[PDB]
Motif scaffolding. Structure first.
Motif, PDB file in Angstrom:
ATOM      1  N   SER A   6      31.040 -55.929   5.350  1.00 51.17           N
ATOM      2  CA  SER A   6      31.108 -55.078   4.165  1.00 51.17           C
ATOM      3  C   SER A   6      30.106 -55.514   3.101  1.00 51.17           C
ATOM      4  CB  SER A   6      32.529 -55.089   3.601  1.00 51.17           C
ATOM      5  OG  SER A   6      33.088 -56.388   3.666  1.00 51.17           O
ATOM      6  N   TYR A   7      30.141 -56.792   2.713  1.00 53.63           N
ATOM      7  CA  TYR A   7      29.245 -57.239   1.654  1.00 53.63           C
ATOM      8  C   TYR A   7      27.808 -57.327   2.147  1.00 53.63           C
ATOM      9  CZ  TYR A   7      29.213 -62.000   3.632  1.00 53.63           C
ATOM     10  OH  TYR A   7      29.056 -63.097   4.450  1.00 53.63           O
ATOM     11  N   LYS A  12      22.532 -55.080   1.530  1.00 50.86           N
ATOM     12  CA  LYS A  12      21.403 -54.394   2.149  1.00 50.86           C
ATOM     13  C   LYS A  12      21.092 -53.092   1.422  1.00 50.86           C
ATOM     14  CE  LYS A  12      21.340 -54.556   6.632  1.00 50.86           C
ATOM     15  NZ  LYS A  12      21.490 -54.258   8.084  1.00 50.86           N
ATOM     16  N   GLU A  13      22.126 -52.332   1.060  1.00 51.01           N
ATOM     17  CA  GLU A  13      21.908 -51.111   0.291  1.00 51.01           C
ATOM     18  C   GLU A  13      21.282 -51.423  -1.063  1.00 51.01           C
ATOM     19  OE1 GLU A  13      23.568 -50.179  -2.626  1.00 51.01           O
ATOM     20  OE2 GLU A  13      22.680 -48.179  -2.783  1.00 51.01           O
ATOM     21  N   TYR A  14      21.784 -52.455  -1.744  1.00 50.13           N
ATOM     22  CA  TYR A  14      21.222 -52.814  -3.043  1.00 50.13           C
ATOM     23  C   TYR A  14      19.756 -53.208  -2.912  1.00 50.13           C
ATOM     24  CZ  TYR A  14      20.840 -54.876  -7.694  1.00 50.13           C
ATOM     25  OH  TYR A  14      20.460 -55.172  -8.982  1.00 50.13           O
ATOM     26  N   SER A  51      16.882 -51.880  -5.105  1.00 51.31           N
ATOM     27  CA  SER A  51      16.070 -52.753  -5.940  1.00 51.31           C
ATOM     28  C   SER A  51      15.727 -54.027  -5.182  1.00 51.31           C
ATOM     29  CB  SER A  51      16.799 -53.109  -7.240  1.00 51.31           C
ATOM     30  OG  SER A  51      17.909 -53.954  -6.987  1.00 51.31           O
ATOM     31  N   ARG A  52      14.484 -54.479  -5.331  1.00 51.34           N
ATOM     32  CA  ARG A  52      14.040 -55.712  -4.698  1.00 51.34           C
ATOM     33  C   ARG A  52      14.614 -56.909  -5.448  1.00 51.34           C
ATOM     34  NH1 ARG A  52      11.859 -50.584  -3.960  1.00 51.34           N
ATOM     35  NH2 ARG A  52      10.485 -50.606  -2.129  1.00 51.34           N
ATOM     36  N   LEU A  53      15.260 -57.808  -4.715  1.00 48.80           N
ATOM     37  CA  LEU A  53      15.971 -58.921  -5.329  1.00 48.80           C
ATOM     38  C   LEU A  53      15.027 -60.088  -5.595  1.00 48.80           C
ATOM     39  CD1 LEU A  53      17.971 -57.345  -3.227  1.00 48.80           C
ATOM     40  CD2 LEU A  53      19.552 -59.179  -3.858  1.00 48.80           C
ATOM     41  N   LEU A  89      18.493 -64.541  -7.672  1.00 48.52           N
ATOM     42  CA  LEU A  89      19.647 -63.740  -7.280  1.00 48.52           C
ATOM     43  C   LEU A  89      19.867 -63.791  -5.774  1.00 48.52           C
ATOM     44  CD1 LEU A  89      19.678 -60.548  -9.552  1.00 48.52           C
ATOM     45  CD2 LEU A  89      21.517 -62.212  -9.236  1.00 48.52           C
ATOM     46  N   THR A  90      18.787 -63.812  -4.988  1.00 49.72           N
ATOM     47  CA  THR A  90      18.940 -63.900  -3.538  1.00 49.72           C
ATOM     48  C   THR A  90      19.644 -65.191  -3.140  1.00 49.72           C
ATOM     49  OG1 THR A  90      16.659 -64.714  -3.477  1.00 49.72           O
ATOM     50  CG2 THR A  90      17.027 -62.391  -2.934  1.00 49.72           C
TER      51      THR A  90
END
Lengths: 117, 287, 63, 45, 275, 276
Positions: E247-248, E253-255, E259-261, E265-266
């Protein structure tokens, strides 16, 4: 229109920044020369037409149009940012030079007030 | 309020003191040959009185004092201070009455250009042109001043400024029902600016203006000019200008004024039309 | 086709938002810096004016 | 965000113009002072 | 290349001539000629010896009755040494900062604090020294009412503290900056990002209190609900409630597709998700 | 720690040295006072640092110096800003008077705006803030600063509508709309200003608002096409119909279409209260 005006007047501000930079450089050189002399003196659609009807059709077209504009805007936005960077650098560098010039004159004055007595 | 009465009284008293000082200065020079110290002090008092008169919103008195100081210092073999005071007087007169500002700015222009300072002369030329344009409709003097300033900037190598003056000249010439100069200026500016990175986005607009400016002469030459501009700048075909011009020509080729009016109305509805562009469209509609 | 276009629009909007925020903060910092230089140059011009006036009066008194 | 940016940009432009005016005054006065110094040194000598 | 050798030879000759002239009132001329030689050497682009000569001239100027000129020479020597032994440049810049503080120019002192912290963090790995320098600069700027630089320094130190696993300081600073931006008419757009970062930092402490933290952030700024960041946070919390990895992973992946992380944050997301 | 006690002791020693030096009877005394004030500033003792700055300012003013005295007064006032708004206001007023005598209008107007901001933020007094804003606006208008004067006038009009009569709001909004509509860049927002005036007319009576909106529409053709005039006309129909339900429906529809400034909401609440 707001974007375009912002860009053109940003370019104008950059031109003014270059002009002031040249003026201050000339001032510094002239001040140093005069001080030394004085010292030496001493995607196909957007709406699923389940309902048919004209209401959908126009909708779709509008979206496409907006999308295209937004696409352009994207690129445009990037451009408007770039110049600022350079300008910022200048707005920093100038400060250094300015201080020195002021300092120089002050020191010169001090020297001119201490040689006499 | 108290500002008016108090400032006027003190400034008038100071001006009378300055007049007495200058009156006695000649006697002092004749009897003792003191020098220019008294003259310099009188000039300083004149400048202070001009400043106070400007502060109290009495523009006429400030301008008179500035002119007096400028003339007095000019008689003292110092042209730079006289020119600066003349520029200040011109600003004050512009605030009150630009007729005196015209001659003050002309004097400043002459003094500055005597030494060869082109930038200040061009700036004063543009100032005089703006003064003429804002109040009067004397397009001739405005165009002459704009052309003179553009020539001065061209001789000084300062790019990015004379082009706007040339664009204004072209716009006013087209407004005066003279199109050859406007067409030439617009095409030259567009071609020159095409190579520049920043100006590229705007270049196409100029071409469209030329087309309109090139449409009053005749339909054949206008069509040929549209074709030449599109071929030289193929990207111009992407913008709405080419489609609008093609639709206008197709509508006008058959005396269908209604279609032309509908196209113009749609274009205006999407984005408001400029006064110059609307006027030119209306003038073309007469045909 | 819905997903591709919707996601493309969202990406463009998010990129515009982020870059506008960053450049707005940059503009704020630039404004602060230019204000500082403005006051600095004002003080410098005032002091040089005072110093040259003092020099003129001193030399005229001595000569 | 665009309309928020606009006001700050306008303020920065106007105060840039003011700073330029101040610098023009300063440079003109500096040139006059240099000319006066040259006159004094040349004539006194 | 002939250019480098020629410039080096010319600068060495000029420096030798200056040394002979000074060795043979004289202090001012010696300092001037030494400064000219240092400038010529810098034009020769030998950073180590150019900086050495420049700081020697600065010391000679210190011998002369002058302070601000010595500080300018010190900062120039530090800039020259920027590509050389870090310790000498750091000490010279610290001395220049001390002189500036004695003179009372806090803005330049804070700028030099930021410069020394930046060089220390970029060149050397020791972080706490750069953090202390940044805190000193932020204190000086806050005393001088320069909110922009103070906020920048606070954000940098908060991000690092989150990196150093001291999440309490990071979340405190982030909440403070978020409320400060919200109060101001401008910069209120990044308050949502600041609150999201504070929530992410809080999550590391525990899981149950994350719900309370997000609820408090929501009731503090209701519009924060509309942001996609709040939706992502609540979705990730719900997914983490159950020991399901898909799920997460799909949500992130959708986020990323949106937007490029950034690197911070990654790594933070990987760290939280791994446990 | 070391910093507090050491800096405090050094500052006290410098103050005593300056007091003794003046007792001997002078520039060195001013330098010592300035240094002592700086040490106090590093020690975080904001209070009594402004006093030392003021003492140095008087000591330097004693010998006809005015520029550095003005700068020291401004710095002392800024320091007192957090410690005591009253002393900061006094010092800033002194600096403004000195600069106005010397003719520095930009610095004087900026200081006036700072005085207005400190008056309205910490203390509770708007009329003095209004007067300060008016003085700054006049100073800027004298220096042909269009944007600063417009901003100050707009803030004054907003405050006047908030607490004072609506005549000031109408006048200032009409003036700003006249100044901005002709301008190319700002015309987009010009409509906004006009609308405010119309709403302020609705506070007095409906007929005045109707006449004002008709005049605005006649003067500005685009004002006719705006959704805002349509909403105002619908609100007028609701008021003449004495139907609060229509008022609420229109207000909520507008809110859903676009968010509110929280001032338009207050004005509309006042208008809807008087429908009766």
């Amino acid at each position: 229109d707001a974007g375009i005006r912002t860009l053109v007047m940003l370019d104008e501000q950059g031109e003014q920044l270059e002009r002031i930079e040249e003026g201050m450089d000339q001032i510094n050189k002239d001040m140093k020369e005069a001080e030394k002399n004085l010292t030496d003196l001493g995607s196909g659609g957007f709406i699923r037409r389940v309902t048919n009807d004209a209401r959908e059709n126009e909708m779709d077209e509008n979206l496409e149009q907006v999308s295209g504009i937004i696409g352009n805007l994207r690129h445009m936005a990037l451009d408007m940012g770039n110049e600022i960077d350079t300008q910022n650098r200048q707005i920093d560098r100038i400060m250094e030079k300015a201080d020195s010039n002021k300092t120089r004159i002050d020191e010169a004055n001090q020297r001119a007030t201490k040689m006499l007595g | 309020g108290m500002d008016t009465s108090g400032k006027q009284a003190e400034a008038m008293a100071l001006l009378a003191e300055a007049e007495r000082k200058v009156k006695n200065s000649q006697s002092f020079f004749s009897g003792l040959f003191g020098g220019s110290s008294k003259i310099e002090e009188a000039c300083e008092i004149y400048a202070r009185a001009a400043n106070m008169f400007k502060m109290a919103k009495n523009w006429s008195a400030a301008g008179n004092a500035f002119c007096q100081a400028a003339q007095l210092h000019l008689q003292l073999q110092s042209k730079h201070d006289a020119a600066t005071c003349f520029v200040d007087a011109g600003n004050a007169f512009k605030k009150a009455d630009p007729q005196e500002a015209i001659n003050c700015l002309m004097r400043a222009i002459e003094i500055y250009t005597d030494m060869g300072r082109f930038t200040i002369a061009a700036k004063h030329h543009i100032s005089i042109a703006e003064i003429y344009e804002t109040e009067l409709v004397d397009v001739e003097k405005a165009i002459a001043h704009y052309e003179q300033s553009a020539d001065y900037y061209k001789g000084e190598e300062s790019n990015s400024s004379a082009n706007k003056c040339l664009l204004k000249v072209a716009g006013y010439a087209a407004q005066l029902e003279q199109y050859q100069k406007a067409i030439d200026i617009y095409e030259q500016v567009g071609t020159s600016a095409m190579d520049s990175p920043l100006l590229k986005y705007s270049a196409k607009d100029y071409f469209f203006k030329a087309a309109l400016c090139h449409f009053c002469i005749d339909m054949l030459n206008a069509k040929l000019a549209v074709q030449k501009y599109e071929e030289l700048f193929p990207a111009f075909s992407d913008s709405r200008e080419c489609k609008l011009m093609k639709k206008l020509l197709e509508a006008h080729e058959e005396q269908n004024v209604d279609s032309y009016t509908e196209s113009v109305k749609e274009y205006d509805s999407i984005s408001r039309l400029d006064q110059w562009l609307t006027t030119m469209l209306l003038r073309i509609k007469k045909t | 086709t819905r997903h591709s276009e919707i996601i493309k629009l969202e990406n463009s909007i998010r990129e515009l938002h982020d870059m506008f925020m960053d450049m707005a903060m940059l503009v704020e910092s630039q404004g602060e810096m230019i204000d500082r230089i403005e006051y600095n140059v004002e003080h410098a011009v005032d002091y040089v004016e005072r110093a040259v006036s003092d020099t003129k009066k001193a030399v005229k008194y001595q000569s």
